[PDB]
């Protein structure tokens, strides 16, 4: 699996997670509501940035980003969430597991782009790893 | 078709159009590139607001917003765009036709919510009509 | 009961609730203290805006707003709170019930002002309903 | 008289009042000069917004806004002011009477647009009524 | 009369004056309307800060602030104003006399808190005296 | 023709051009719509500043600015535009010719005010020439 | 009297007027107190800028600005004000007469600097004339 | 123990608490993570201000602030925390006890500086007491 | 010498020092020019604040501030500086000695206002001491 | 060719391109004038940053940046543009080819600095590649 | 030598001085490093503004600005600096002499543009003289 | 020595240098006082950021940051400074040598993290090297 393919799969994961976290946003229950509600807004606004970043990296490489939701659904490795009620504990557990998935995928992006001498994608992959590793650390602490 | 059903169909249209306009964003060609590129960013940021607005209106009404992309695709009336190259003329024509569709749908939202005495949804529907009518006017002028 | 009378009763409720929520502000206990303390500040600052809005709507209609606390106490439908210690759960339950009361009263304001052809008051009533319905939704979620 | 006709007459009134209030701006006498001078600036900047708002509402409806001063003068119901010296009392009396005129005209705009099912114009008419009713209240108080 | 008692009486005066000055705000007549209207807004926003400051000082001392309007009315030394029409001269005279009252009361707060070694309350009392003495000076000049 | 007369004729031209450019604003057609629409807004906001500047210069000189639209129409040298549809090319050509006219008139203002020793008007005339010469240069480039 | 001499006399007038207007600031009586108090602050902050501007112009010319109050008093043409109570009418009359004096002096600065080919001082003199002529116009209107 | 000695001991406590609270910052566990994490950042940024304030007060008095960590450790009365995992409850209890300690020490600073006639240090001590008393109140409420 | 007398003498010192430091501002020589030039601007802007503060404190006490430069010169204890060339070393030495003078005078203000029970003036005196003691410390370091 | 040599050649290219793009800025013709004019300003402001960045990287490495235009002209690989009239199409083609050149040169900077273990220059080279690749993508789209 | 020729020679001087001052920026030695480094940045950012100003003035006059570095070098009267190490004293001396040169050249620009009746260029020349005369004054003081 | 060990030693160096530079801050002597005083504040605010950055990197790696000053003192390689008086020359020499030390240590962090495939730490190490290399360059210039 080569660089543009990894990016396209990640673009698909970003839009799917943009959606899944909106679900958490709307359907969180319990007294720390304002907190989760606030934090989920910042998270899905991050996914939409990731989505746009990945797409423009694909274009700059000479390839076509994904341009439909059905292609997103075809290419994603993320399970969509159908439940409609959550406490902060359940939401943080879900987001953690997805963060861990993305962390593995950005690690492969980094390593594969290095093998092809694509320095700009390495730098981009390494910047996302830094953000993911920090969020994973924080979420791991929420659950302890 | 009752108020929450109309809202849910519109929520589905917003996410699908959020995606379609990203396509225009990435794939516009020609010398007014910066202009289109800039304008499409403002448009899909509007769809994501519309998406979140509609969802929270659905929740406040006691119902569940849509929480998956496959439900978006099931409920939408919008055709997804598979082409990957455009000039500003082609993009503006597409966006106009979709604006006209939404304008009809928000008109039905307004009228149906009035029949049920749902004043808050009327006000919301009427605010979106004002924005749509202004954008339609402007787009109609781009194409003249 | 006619438009200016409904407004005056609501003006009385706003000042009384401005006070009741200060009580919650000062007397909240437990580890989410900063959260409640912050949120109550935003709530009673909203009541004081509501108080000033209702008063100036009364004046514009040709009538006198209420100008004393004893008239507030005479006209209010809100029970004053004498307790001086609370957790976030108790505070959110109280505020919800009062929000529901105001929501019924703004609904009557809307309907009565429509019967008299007072469009400006309808618009104002409908704007407050939108805010109340959103806050009710959120508070209902805090308690689930 | 139908919706676009009422709007066009109002567009004509806005430009004429934009001018009349500049006259007050320049020609106010007495020790509260800074006050009037300041307030008239805010008033004619409001008329120019009203002028541009009405024009773009006319365009969105499929019709042509007025595009010349002589058409403004043909269609206006406002008497132009030829005097060149005033105290604050004289200025506030003039502006009040014109505000009352506009308030009647926006009331007809609201009612006529309702009869045609033009929701966006109703909302716009109702927003201007709210501003006019507040300014009328204040000006009525200046003169008491 | 000991420190917390003086504070509680002052808390009662602040809410009562918050109300009385709203009356001036709404019911001022004459050509300097914008001025009074503006100044009264800044004054009652000061009383609400004073109200919240005094309450939190009471809490920090281990005691309960007042939490109802009827307790405000029981403890206040301020006469509520029932009239509903004023010129700037009448309003400034009223506010001056109330400022003088508060100045005497904050002087006693300062002296009593010194006798108990309550340095934080002294500093707070002395800060309010500085504000009151400046406002008294200015109001005394309005009336000369 | 003496200084105050030249200023008054220019005041008349500014209001007439304020109007003519609103026409361009509303009635521009073609794909660079956002651009023209944006630029015309900045242009007529400049004319309204010019209008107010000229008027206050007239007042400071001891004379009366023009205070009616019919006096504007009597004194102007600008032809009002009755057409209601344009491309950017047609709009820029129109605005250029009017800029050239104003440039000649501000040159006469400068020279005549110098002959009377009116230094403040010279400085003002010279500042407007600088702005006009820059805009003329730019518009001349649009059409090449 | 040559350029640096005119500047030095003006520097002396600026500091003396800085002081005289502080007197007005502190000692104004009557209900428009806030207005005068505000306006005098802006006026003496202008004199202190004028003072610093004139001084640095003197230095740039190779000469020494005045560096003591007694030299200010020796060189000034302004009468110091010993009274300690005023209404807005008395204050505006005083400031007008001093503005007229400065206007004559800046006119001589302009003409003398022209005779010596000192373009920078001309430009500076002409900028102060513009400010003075505008303030004179406004003050003349306060007194009508 | 004289004024500069009390200040130096407090400087030592501030740096030690700056460190201890970083520990809480990094090692907090549980779902209100964002809250604690946020609040601890604001707390240790306060200690570093206190540290710099105390040091510059010592210098202004003619003495040397502490300039090494080992001198901090020699002079501090605060126990360093070696544990590396906490919930919000444990953190708030720790911070409260340290706040109470500092409150006693600033009380002695105030009283000792009064005995020496050092007014600036009294004012500084009294300002820190106000902040400490407010934070103690809030923390006491977190634990109820 | 009683409180208002001490204040009036200090008002006289502030205006005289405002002037003396302008001299330093204009006439500093050497390579750290920008530094001194910058710092002197901040210093004389402080004196003008001190001047206005002292004056309004005098007024609030029922007395007349000084309103002429000749009264400033009569009452000041500060020697005016006639030299017109300095290095940073000479300027800092001068400013230090004047700071020390003011520090003694504000100490007497504090002590005398305490004897009369004038708490607001004490607080004001103590705030100026804090600023003076900090500046003295810094200037003493410049010269070491 | 070693790291400092590559940097110095790039410094020479940046100043030469800073100049060439000013030419485009001034001499662009056609109706999208504002667009090009705006974009060229942002481009040559980027070259001047690149120029200063490269120079300070050279200095930090122990070597001398280029300090004359004739050394710029000696070392540059960029052809200077002598034509003085362009449409947006011609300008974008020119800038693209130069962007491609710089992209090759920054790729060599990256690879050579890696061979010498100069991590800071690699990071800097990789950051410029990211910017260049994005601009190349966009310009390539302008021309399609 | 006529107006456009003088401007073009000055454009050449601005780019050459932009470069020479970058040299000072990078190569200043000694403890006031931050100061020089800061000041040189502000100076060469001024030259680049001067460069762009002169160029656009040339274009507005109907002529071609210089568009290559070799034309800059051909037309300049400024000696390029080849040294690569300086103290603040050496840098300020260099910049002063170049400021004096530009001051003579802008004086000729002013006088020649007056002879041709080119008012806009006079105003521009006179504005640059004001800036140059102020900087010359300051630099002359650095060296005393 | 492995990655987390290098980070922990650096965390210890950051807190120790945070302290040492406070010493320079407080105890600098001579006329460029404001400069050093300002620069040291920016430097120790950088160390506290470095301290917090290193700590959170340690936590994200699964290890415990240092949480006591005595552990800082145990692990540091930096000599604490006991002197209490300095000129800018002495301070800059000290800070340079410590910057050089940190530069060697961040180089080892980079190389060791590369050997373990820890990309996020490499990126972080390389970002600190860039800052250190720039500061070293500047400090080296201060001392030349
Ligand atoms: Fe994008
Ligand atoms: Fe939301
Ligand atoms: Fe209000
Ligand atoms: Fe518009
Ligand atoms: Fe609305
Ligand atoms: Fe509060
Ligand atoms: Fe105006
Ligand atoms: Fe000018
Ligand atoms: Fe200055
Ligand atoms: Fe400090
Ligand atoms: Fe204080
Ligand atoms: Fe004042
Ligand atoms: Fe730089
Ligand atoms: Fe430009
Ligand atoms: Fe942190
Ligand atoms: Fe990076």
Automatic annotation (TrEMBL), chains A, B, C, D, E, F, G, H, I, J, K, L:
Zn(2+) 4 binds at residues 41, 45. Zn(2+) 2 binds at residues 25, 52, 56. Zn(2+) 6 binds at residue 87. Zn(2+) 3 binds at residues 37, 56. GO terms for cellular component: cytoplasm. It is found in: Cytoplasm. It holds the Pfam family Ferritin. The gene is napA. Residues 5-143 form the Ferritin/DPS domain. This is Neutrophil-activating protein. GO terms for molecular function: ferric iron binding; oxidoreductase activity, acting on metal ions. Fe(3+) binds at residues 25, 52, 56. Keywords: Metal-binding, Zinc. InterPro entries: DPS_DNA-bd, DPS_DNA-bd_CS, Ferritin-like, Ferritin-like_SF, Ferritin_DPS_dom.
């Amino acid at each position: 699996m080569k660089t543009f393919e990894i990016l396209k799969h990640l673009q698909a994961d970003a839009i799917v997670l943009f959606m899944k976290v909106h679900n958490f946003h709307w359907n969180v229950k319990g007294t720390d509501f304002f907190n989760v509600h606030k934090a989920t807004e910042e998270i899905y606004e991050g996914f939409a940035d990731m989505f746009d970043d990945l797409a423009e990296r694909i274009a700059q490489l000479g390839h076509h980003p994904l341009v439909t939701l059905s292609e997103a659904l075809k290419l994603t490795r993320v399970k969509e969430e159908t439940k409609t009620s959550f406490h902060s504990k359940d939401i943080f557990k879900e987001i953690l597991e997805d963060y861990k998935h993305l962390e593995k995928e950005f690690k492969e992006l980094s390593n594969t782009a290095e093998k092809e001498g694509d320095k700009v994608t390495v730098t981009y992959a390494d910047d996302q790893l830094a953000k993911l590793q920090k969020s994973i650390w924080m979420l791991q602490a929420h659950l302890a």
